[PDB]
Amino acid sequence: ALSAWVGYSVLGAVLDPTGKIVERFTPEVAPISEERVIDVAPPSYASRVGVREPLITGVRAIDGLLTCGVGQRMGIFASAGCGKTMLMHMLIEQTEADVFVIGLIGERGREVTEFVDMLRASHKKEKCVLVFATSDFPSVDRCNAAQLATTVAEYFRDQGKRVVLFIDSMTRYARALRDVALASGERPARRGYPASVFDNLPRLLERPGATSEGSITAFYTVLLESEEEADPMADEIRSILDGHLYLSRKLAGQGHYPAIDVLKSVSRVFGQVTTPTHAEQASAVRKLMTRLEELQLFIDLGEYRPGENIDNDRAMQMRDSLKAWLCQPVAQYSSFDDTLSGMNAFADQNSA
Ligand SMILES: [Cl-]
Ligand SMILES: [Cl-]
Prior knowledge:
42% helix; translocase; binds chloride ion; ATP-binding; ATP binding; cytoplasm
């Protein structure tokens, strides 16, 4: 089966879908590598441990309300122009991990080179590996890119490292699987996709996870056609993940970054990686957000006037304060303690 050289020799490097080093944005760490088959089955369920430890991203909205866990699979769902790529760079810069693996699947060449240029300027550059396939690549190679990125991550997990994996995007990975399946003689099952696709998606997504000694936490991007629209592929991918961050074109338009729609987003490992006090505070802040969106639609289309009802003005100030807290430009790391102090403040505010 199709195999590639992976190891410490690819840290700081750009790989094409065959594992060839086509560029180094930092000098080689060590010439240690081994051949691995890139399309392999997930490990035995009995070989894992639970996702129980939080993965601190330094992003207030995520760490506070959508806390990720070490070994989790997390979706990033976005239409075009929602800041997905900037959020990926933020997660790389601010998360503590031993290794970052980025797989860009069917991305345009310019975007690949821009991503690599960003990595070249990163202070974590020697921990990063980028695997790419452009739109010019055949479908087989595009699938291989995601499999190879996962395989590099598994290599470092086996060395006992904490690895963070990005696959951008699972939409293009699914389309590549579909095209390979069609060209192999398979008939469309749902909305053009053969049934083989819906079985090979979990095969790729179940490979990350935690062990007693290493881990892979994985972020998978999914390209929505528009912010609010009926998408079956996205729903399926969401159904097989441990959570999803929905990015909002509306919030992006307002310059609100990260453009996370908190009420549409969830981390399914939240309860198992947070303290009871944190979970209580997050419940309170979600109740507050739902109350605030209720009042927002209530008066902001019911012709709100700043001064009519002072309770409405209190609510609007609280809404603006929470939005300002969720907004976080790059280079503004928030420690988990500081995030929790903010959560405690807004949970207090839920008592009004
Ligand atoms: Cl592994
Ligand atoms: Cl309120």
